[PDB]
Each structure stands twice: as structure tokens, then as C-alpha cells.
Structure 1
Amino acid sequence: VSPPPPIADEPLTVNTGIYLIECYSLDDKAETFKVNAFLSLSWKDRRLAFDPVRSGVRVKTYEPEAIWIPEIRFVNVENARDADVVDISVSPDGTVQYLERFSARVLSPLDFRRYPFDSQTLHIYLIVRSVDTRNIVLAVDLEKVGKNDDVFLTGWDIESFTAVVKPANFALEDRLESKLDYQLRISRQYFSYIPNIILPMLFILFISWTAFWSTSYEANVTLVVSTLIAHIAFNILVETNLPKTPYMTYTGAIIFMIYLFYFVAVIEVTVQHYLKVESQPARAASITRASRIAFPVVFLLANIILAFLFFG
């Protein structure tokens, strides 16, 4: 009903804590995820103090009404959280214990420079607005921060869930506000990607590369163009999941390099056939023998170079 008045000028300290219960629905394209967790708050109010001996009880229970509770809000959320009060307890000295359970949709950016083998960090911001009569600051209670053993994400491993103890204080809208950071570190499970994407691509590439042992123009043309069509289908299937970024990624580089290889293979096949038509069956043979060795070595070298560039 009214914020507790200070003794002389000290600000009001509120201790926070978040205990995760469920986390799910991590969308790459929308860069959002859903959370379900506990919120704990604690502060000091001497107006609620009582004598345990006289009252005959140790802990008093209060309704959410007829008591002052600070408004804590999330910054990076789509809508306001859906929360219910679980319990409210008051100690004889005046310490208030608050607890609730909530659920919200969090918006956070992601980095896809290493998309198949990337790691991300998720941020949750807590903020509080100072009233005209009292300054409010936030603090972290490390004994009430954690997560359950059953918390799982589809396609991700959860590493740690910690918080930055030092808040950030700044002025917004002629008011002082304190902000807190809760960080959740996850890593992607890349096992399903290998046998579903990487290996069939290599098989199709090798199938395309068998035209350097044939002298039929029509058969080489069929092989190369059909393998190009299959590459296009696979590239469409891959792009239907990865969003667009203003920077270059590993997968896009590999795909572009594969298109360049297909183009060079078409060019080599045309040059072989053209030389063979003009009654020069030695230069075509030399070029074919050279290409047989040149293609796989150049492919391996460019793959090593790309891997060092992106992961070095």
C-alpha cells in the first residue's frame, strides 16, 4: 500500500532468484524460447514486525493484497508473464518471503557463424523502477538459483545457469532503474546432422566425379546435371531451416563451393568433348588424367582452409 520509509537515506535492497522447471520451444527463425520457472523475492519491512512470544506464532501469512510488493518486470519478453502467488511469509524481525510460479516467452538473438557446431548464450533481464520516495536496488541470492534434473531441450544440451551478481544502474524516464542478468549456456547436438546431410552429399559428389573415367558425352552430361539437381534439392531442404543472416556462415560457404565445383566439372566435360571432336585425342586424355587427381585434392584443401578460417 506504501513503500517502506527509509531510516535516513539507505536504498531498499531486494534479493532475487530463479529456479528453472521447464524450458521448451526454441525457434531458430524467430529466436524465441519458452520458460517455466520459480520467482523468489525478499526485502525488509519493519512495519510488519511482531513479538513471537505475545502472538504465539513464529511465521505470519499474508494475502497478496494489504501488503506492499515491488513490481518486477522482464525486459525481453513478448507479453507480460502469467504468474500466481504461491506463498507469502513474514519473519518476526520484518523480513518478507515471496514466491511465485510464472511462464513467459523470451526473445533473444542468436549467432549462426558455426551453425552445425555452434554454442549459444540466452539472456533473461530483470528490472525494477524506483518510486518517488524510495530508491530500489536488486541483488542476487546464490542459494536460490538453479534448475531441475529433468529440464531438457529438444536438440540442445544444457551446460550451466548462472547470474551476474553486479547489477546495472541507470536513469530512464527521469527514474533510476536496476537491471540484472541471468545467463543460460547451451550447445547444439550435431550427431543427427552427419549421417543425414554430410555423408549423402559426399556420395552424390563422388557419383558426379565418375565422368572422368568415361568418354561418352551424353552419359557424362546426364550424370553431372542430375547430380546438380539433387544438390539443389538438398540445398533447398537445408535452407528451409536456417534463417538469413547479415554475415557468412560455414554451411553457405560449403554449398557455394559445391556449386563452383559442379560448374568447373561441366566446363571440363565440355572442353574434353570439344578437343575430341577436333581430332586431338591426346590433349583430352591428358586433361582427363590431370582432372582425376586435381579435383579431390583441391576439394580437400579448400575444405581444410574453410575449417581453419571458421574454427580458428
Structure 2
Amino acid sequence: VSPPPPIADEPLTVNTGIYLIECYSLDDKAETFKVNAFLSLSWKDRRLAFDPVRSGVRVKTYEPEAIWIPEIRFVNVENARDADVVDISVSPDGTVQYLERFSARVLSPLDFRRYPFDSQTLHIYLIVRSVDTRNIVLAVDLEKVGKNDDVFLTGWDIESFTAVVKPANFALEDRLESKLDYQLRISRQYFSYIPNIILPMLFILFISWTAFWSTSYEANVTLVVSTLIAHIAFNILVETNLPKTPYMTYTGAIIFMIYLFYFVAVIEVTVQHYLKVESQPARAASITRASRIAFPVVFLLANIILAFLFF
């Protein structure tokens, strides 16, 4: 019921820990992710200390209403964290060990520039409100911070679950207090995105490049334009995988460059035809012969420039 009284001006330290059981629903559209984990809280309350002789046992189990529990909340969540309390154990010195199982949709922005090689830092912000009697400060108990052997992260590599040990206070409210940040560093796995996205998109463009080894303007127009259609269609096919970003992404820049190369390939084919029809087939043949190397070289070069710009 009542908060524990402070022996001195020192604030009450609440040790926190999150044991990630499962992470489901990775909505790349809303930049939200659902989490199911264990939340552990540890704090010393002299009020519940006892002697083990007269009490008999070494541990005392209470119900959430029977004792005082700090109001711990999550900052970046869609709605209040659904709470299922598991156990409350008090040690002889009065140290309370709280454990609850929770599940909540977390708001965590994602940077899609480096996609599909991008690395992300998922954040889970813990916060506590200090009362008039008593101030409450949060701490991280590394022994209660962990991820299970059955942690499944399909498509990502879990780099580090290391929570922010020094989490700066958010000056939003009138009274500033330290909000314990939980940084989960992950890196995207890409073994599929090449054979499923990049490679076939390169194949269609290379097919368009066969117009440099032909003289029939009709066949060349069919090649370039029909391949352009195939490219659009393929983009429609993979649209789900690609991200709808208001900023420029690496992938998006490659796509744009491919569109430019289709335009230039059209220009080339048209010029070659015009020169042949205007009775100068020597120039037409020279341009086409040059394009056979120029296009792949310029493409590979611009890809190195792009890669350099983004990485």
C-alpha cells in the first residue's frame, strides 16, 4: 500500500530486467513490432523484512495488492502493456523479486537506407514516476537481461541485447527523470534477396542490352520496350518486399538508375536506326559497337559509386 520510507535522502533503486521470450509480427509498414517477454523488478523494502526463525521459511510470497509495487510503464508502445503477474518473492533482508509476463506492440523507427543489408537498433524505453515521499530511479540487472536458446528471429541476426546502462533523462515532462532504454541491435540476413530480387532484375536489363548486337530496329524496339514492361511487372511482383520510403534508399537509387539505363538504351537504338536510315551506317555501327562495352562498364561503375555513397 504505502511507499517504503527513505532512510536518508537517497532515492529508491529499482533493478529491472527483460527476458525476451518471443518476438512476433514484424510490421515493416507501421514500423511496429510485437514483443512477448518477462519483466523482472528488484527493490529492497525494509518494511517486509523478517527473521527466518519465528517465520520458519526463508522466502515470503505476497500478492500484488498486499504490497507496494512501483508503477513501471513503457514509453514507446501502441497501448498500455498488457500485464500478467507471475510471482512476487521476498528474501529475508526484505529484497522484493517481482516477475510478470507481458506482451505489447512497440513503436520503433526503422532506417531503410542500407536495405537489404541494413542494421537496426530496436528500442524499448522503460520509465518510472517518482512520488512525493521517496524519488524512484531505475537500474539494469544484467543477470535478468537475456534472450533464450529458443529465441527465433527469422531473417535477422541478433547482434546485441545490451540495454543502455546510462539512459539520458527525457526532458518532456516538468520533472525530468532517467528512462531506462533497451537497445536490441539486429542485422538483416540477405541470402534470398539476391536470387529473388536483384539477379532477375539484372537479367531483364541484360536482355535489353542484346539490342546492341542486332540491326533490326523492329526487334530492338521489341527488346528494349518489352523488357522495360517486364521490369515494371517484376517491380510489381516484388513491391511487397521493397519499402515505401519518403527518403532516398540505396535500392531505390539502383531502381532509378535501371530506369535511366532503359531510357538511354532506347536513345541508342533510335540513334543507330536514324544514322543507318540517313545513310551513315559507319557511325551507327561504331556507336552500337561502343555501347556493347560502355553500358556494362558505366553500369558497374555507377553501382560502385552508389555502394560507396551508401556504405
Deviations 1:193-213 (A, max 9, x none): 111122212221221111122
2:307 is equivalent to residue 286 of structure 1:
no
Q: Which runs of 5+ in 2 are unaligned?
A: none
CA RMSD of superposed structures (Å): 1.6
CA distance in 2, matches of 1:173, 1:208: 59
Give yes or no for contact 1:129–1:176 (8 Å, CA) kept in 2.
Answer: no
Give the 3 Å change call, closer, same or farther, for CA 275–172 of structure 1 in structure 2: closer
User: How far apart are 1:144 and its partner, in Å?
Assistant: 1.1
User: How far apart are 1:3 and its partner, in Å?
Assistant: 0.5
Deviations 1:86-144 (A, max 9, x none): 11111222211111111111110011111111111101000000111111111111111
CA distance in 2, matches of 1:171, 1:275: 69
CA distance in 1, matches of 2:232, 2:222: 15
Give yes or no for contact 1:224–1:266 (8 Å, CA) kept in 2.
Answer: yes
CA distance in 1, matches of 2:224, 2:174: 67
Indicate the SS of the match to 2:247. coil
Point out the more displaced range, 162-171 or 66-75: 162-171
Indicate the SS of the match to 2:82. coil
Give yes or no for contact 1:28–1:242 (8 Å, CA) kept in 2.
Answer: no
Give the 3 Å change call, closer, same or farther, for CA 69–285 of structure 1 in structure 2: same
Give the 3 Å change call, closer, same or farther, for CA 62–256 of structure 1 in structure 2: same
Give yes or no for contact 1:13–1:139 (8 Å, CA) kept in 2.
Answer: yes
Give the 3 Å change call, closer, same or farther, for CA 220–176 of structure 1 in structure 2: closer
CA distance in 1, matches of 2:281, 2:10: 94
Give the 3 Å change call, closer, same or farther, for CA 173–275 of structure 1 in structure 2: closer
Give the 3 Å change call, closer, same or farther, for CA 256–173 of structure 1 in structure 2: closer
User: How far apart are 1:85 and its partner, in Å?
Assistant: 1.5
Indicate the SS of the match to 1:236. helix
CA distance in 2, matches of 1:247, 1:173: 31
Give yes or no for contact 1:24–1:152 (8 Å, CA) kept in 2.
Answer: no
Aligned length: 311
Match of 2:257 in 1: 257
CA distance in 2, matches of 1:169, 1:240: 38
Point out the more displaced range, 300-309 or 168-177: 168-177
User: How far apart are 1:303 and its partner, in Å?
Assistant: 1.4
CA distance in 1, matches of 2:231, 2:197: 11
Give yes or no for contact 1:152–1:158 (8 Å, CA) kept in 2.
Answer: no
User: How far apart are 1:244 and its partner, in Å?
Assistant: 3.0
User: How far apart are 1:180 and its partner, in Å?
Assistant: 0.2
Give the 3 Å change call, closer, same or farther, for CA 174–203 of structure 1 in structure 2: closer
Point out the more displaced range, 156-165 or 29-38: 156-165
User: How far apart are 1:236 and its partner, in Å?
Assistant: 2.7
Percent of paired sites with the same residue: 100
Give yes or no for contact 1:76–1:108 (8 Å, CA) kept in 2.
Answer: yes
Indicate the SS of the match to 2:165. strand
TM-score when normalising by structure 1? 0.95
CA distance in 2, matches of 1:220, 1:174: 69
TM-score when normalising by structure 2? 0.95
Point out the more displaced range, 108-117 or 161-170: 161-170
CA distance in 2, matches of 1:36, 1:260: 46
CA distance in 2, matches of 1:17, 1:151: 17
Give the 3 Å change call, closer, same or farther, for CA 53–296 of structure 1 in structure 2: same
Give the 3 Å change call, closer, same or farther, for CA 172–232 of structure 1 in structure 2: closer
User: How far apart are 1:281 and its partner, in Å?
Assistant: 2.2
User: How far apart are 1:21 and its partner, in Å?
Assistant: 0.8
CA distance in 2, matches of 1:109, 1:306: 24
Give yes or no for contact 1:88–1:98 (8 Å, CA) kept in 2.
Answer: yes
Give the 3 Å change call, closer, same or farther, for CA 100–284 of structure 1 in structure 2: same
User: How far apart are 1:154 and its partner, in Å?
Assistant: 2.2
Match of 1:298 in 2: 298
User: How far apart are 1:12 and its partner, in Å?
Assistant: 0.8
Give the 3 Å change call, closer, same or farther, for CA 101–295 of structure 1 in structure 2: same
Q: Is the strand fraction higher in 1 or 2?
A: 1
Give yes or no for contact 1:130–1:175 (8 Å, CA) kept in 2.
Answer: no
Match of 1:231 in 2: 231
CA distance in 2, matches of 1:252, 1:74: 35
